[PDB]
């Protein structure tokens, strides 16, 4: 059931590294992105998938100093996770679409952002089906350059979000929902 899959996906902050099959996890991440729709089939999403030492480096050597340097002028729960999936949008593709179809120039950035949300939650949900939890963070644009430098990423990759994932060590908290009447109108 697809609806059940959606419902199974939740924000999980308590994450560990009790992950049985890392290759399957990577395969599933790629498939979730692969089968996600994008305007003009532009496929503007780009991923950096960090685990092990790279996961440690991101949070200890990049995020923490950047935050501390920023503040002045506990992230250990994130580091404890199995990995982080950093989602970017390729601005070179966006810009070329704007040039090729000048009529829709304003739309491509919008559709690109929508596309980021799309692939982020599809991956999030696919991981949840594997029994893994995740949470979505936004330390961009603060960590952008350090991440690009560390992993030699093209300048055209615009960081949009970081999905931290791993074994579920504590359940999701409570969540409320709007009144249906306030967000759905059905007309015959």
Ligand X SMILES: O=[N+]([O-])c1ccc(O)cc1
**Footprint on this chain of ligand FMN (rule: CB under 6 A):** 10-11, 37-41, 111, 114-115, 117-118, 135-138, 172, 175
Distance CA 137, CA 45 (A): 17
Within residues 27-56, the interface with ligand X by CB under 6 A covers 39-40
- Name the binder of 122 from a copy of itself, ligand X, ligand FMN, none, CB < 5-8 A by kind: a copy of itself
Q: Gaps in the chain (C–N > 2.5 Å) come after which residues?
A: 73
Contact 62, 150 (CB under 8 A): yes
Q: How far is the CB of 42 from a copy of itself (least distance, A)?
A: 10
Farthest-apart Cα atoms in the chain, separation: 58
The yes or no reply on residue 186 touching a copy of itself (CB under 8 A) is yes
Neighbour tally for 72: CB within 10 Å: 6
Which letter, b or e, does each residue of 115-134 get, where b requires 16 or more Cβ atoms within 10 Å of its Cβ? bbebbbbbbbbbbbeeebbb
Q: Would the annotation count 137 as a binding residue?
A: yes
Kindly write out the interface string for residues 121-160 of this chain, putting x where it contacts a copy of itself by CB under 8 A and - elsewhere: xx-xxx--x------x-x------------x-x------x
Nearest 10 degrees: Cα torsion 34, 139, 54, 82: -70
On whether 10 is known to bind a ligand per the annotation, the reply is: yes
17 is in an annotated binding site: no
Residues near a copy of itself, by CB under 8 A? 1-3, 5-7, 9, 11, 26, 28-37, 41, 43, 45-54, 90, 107, 110-111, 113-118, 120-122, 124-126, 129, 136, 138, 151, 153, 160, 175-178, 180, 183-188
């Amino acid at each position: 059931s697809f609806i059940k899959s959606l419902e199974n996906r939740r924000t999980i902050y308590a994450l560990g590294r009790n992950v049985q099959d890392e290759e399957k996890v990577i395969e599933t991440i790629k498939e979730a992105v692969r089968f996600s729709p994008t305007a003009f089939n532009s496929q503007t999403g780009r991923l950096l998938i960090l685990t092990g030492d790279a996961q440690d480096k991101l949070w200890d050597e990049i995020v923490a100093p950047e935050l501390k340097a920023a503040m002045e002028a506990k992230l250990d729960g994130f580091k404890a996770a199995f990995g982080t999936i950093l989602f970017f949008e390729d601005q070179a593709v966006v810009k070329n679409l704007q040039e090729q179809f000048a009529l829709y120039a304003d739309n491509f950035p919008v559709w690109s952002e929508q596309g980021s949300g799309i692939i982020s939650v599809n991956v999030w949900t696919a991981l949840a089906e594997l029994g893994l939890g995740a949470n979505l963070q936004h330390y961009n644009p603060l960590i952008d350059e350090a991440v690009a430098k560390e992993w030699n990423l093209p300048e055209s990759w615009k960081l949009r979000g970081q999905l931290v994932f791993g074994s579920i060590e504590a359940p999701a908290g409570e969540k409320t929902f709007m009144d249906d009447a306030d967000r759905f109108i059905v007309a015959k």
